[PDB]
Scaffold this active site. Sequence first.
Site, PDB file in Angstrom:
ATOM      1  N   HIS B  65      -1.837   0.060  11.294  1.00  0.00           N
ATOM      2  CA  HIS B  65      -0.413   0.180  10.995  1.00  0.00           C
ATOM      3  C   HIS B  65      -0.055   1.452  10.277  1.00  0.00           C
ATOM      4  CE1 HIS B  65      -0.143  -4.501  11.077  1.00  0.00           C
ATOM      5  NE2 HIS B  65      -0.071  -3.973  12.286  1.00  0.00           N
ATOM      6  N   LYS B  74      -0.737   4.046   0.326  1.00  0.00           N
ATOM      7  CA  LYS B  74      -1.101   2.656   0.084  1.00  0.00           C
ATOM      8  C   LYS B  74      -2.379   2.623  -0.741  1.00  0.00           C
ATOM      9  CE  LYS B  74       0.713   1.372   4.593  1.00  0.00           C
ATOM     10  NZ  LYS B  74       0.352   1.170   6.070  1.00  0.00           N
ATOM     11  N   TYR B 134      -1.907  -4.613  -2.063  1.00  0.00           N
ATOM     12  CA  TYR B 134      -1.757  -3.178  -2.072  1.00  0.00           C
ATOM     13  C   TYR B 134      -0.445  -2.750  -2.701  1.00  0.00           C
ATOM     14  CZ  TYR B 134       0.944  -3.783   2.260  1.00  0.00           C
ATOM     15  OH  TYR B 134       1.895  -4.144   3.182  1.00  0.00           O
ATOM     16  N   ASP B 171      -0.215  -6.568  17.320  1.00  0.00           N
ATOM     17  CA  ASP B 171      -1.387  -5.722  17.150  1.00  0.00           C
ATOM     18  C   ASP B 171      -2.211  -5.677  18.435  1.00  0.00           C
ATOM     19  OD1 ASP B 171      -0.653  -5.103  14.506  1.00  0.00           O
ATOM     20  OD2 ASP B 171      -2.092  -6.488  13.611  1.00  0.00           O
TER      21      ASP B 171
END
Lengths: 184, 184
Positions: B65, B74, B134, B171
Amino acid sequence: SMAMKATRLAIPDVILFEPRVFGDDRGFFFESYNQRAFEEACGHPVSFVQDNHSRSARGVLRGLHYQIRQAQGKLVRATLGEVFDVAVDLRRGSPTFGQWVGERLSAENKRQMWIPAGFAHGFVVLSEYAEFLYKTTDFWAPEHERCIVWNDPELKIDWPLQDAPLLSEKDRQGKAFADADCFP
Amino acid sequence: SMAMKATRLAIPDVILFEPRVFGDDRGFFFESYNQRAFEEACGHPVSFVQDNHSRSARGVLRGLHYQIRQAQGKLVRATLGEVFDVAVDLRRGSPTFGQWVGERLSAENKRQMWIPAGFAHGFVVLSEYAEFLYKTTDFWAPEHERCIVWNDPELKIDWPLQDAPLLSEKDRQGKAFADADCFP
């Protein structure tokens, strides 16, 4: 109005957050912090400079801690197990000075507390083990940290305990509320 | 030099952090984030606006992603279980464009990865369950998120898997690396 619950507690500057969950037990997602929602909730801008992660066994009590120099707001949650988390108002001239609030926070209920600069903070572990994490607005400094004793008779906090807590020597030696230096 | 290990990976802007632990298994403390150490490590100022917490079962793969508009750095870690976490360099003109790095992150090893704006990101769950969290520098927006397929033959990422992953439809429908729009 939002997309994570925010609730003002009996002491209104102490806030309980509950994130919306997407998914279920087999597979979920939630926001544990959103700057916009948080800043809209507490009414001012906030910056977190440090995150702290801890693991403590059943009945361990850590508190009641606060820093007068390098004063800290703290946003606290449990990612494993269950704590009872406590905030004590120590602000000069506060209409609720000397008052406490407490909430059970856990990995199941996903609840969090914002405890602003000016408060003392403590928790006791209720589950077999608890993992506790928090975000602070200034760094944890032991040479500035002060302590009020957990079982102070004037605050008379209602710890949901059946057995004596396991305290560190430092917390055992906590100041009585009466004798405590508080916040300007 | 510090007081949490920082290691530049084969792609030097991707950084692995390891916090120092105080205590042991029965009761420990560690800093999961320190603004000063982090900003000294990555060479610039960073602001995190959102934290995201997730739970996924064994063999669930989420990736690869990235957001071109509302680009995000991130900082990722596992608080429960074990993932294999992957960063893919997608920066225009990068000398390592199209390269990947991967590290096992877990609640035991307490390791983290900083994956700057310009990279794609993915992980696969290796333990029975994993809880992943995250911190991002900008908000997760599905209408801007793009995806490269996990098993792309050109990237040829070495997923430590013995069984097929469990992917979401989105995905599964990830773009081939060849066809992917990348970062200015």
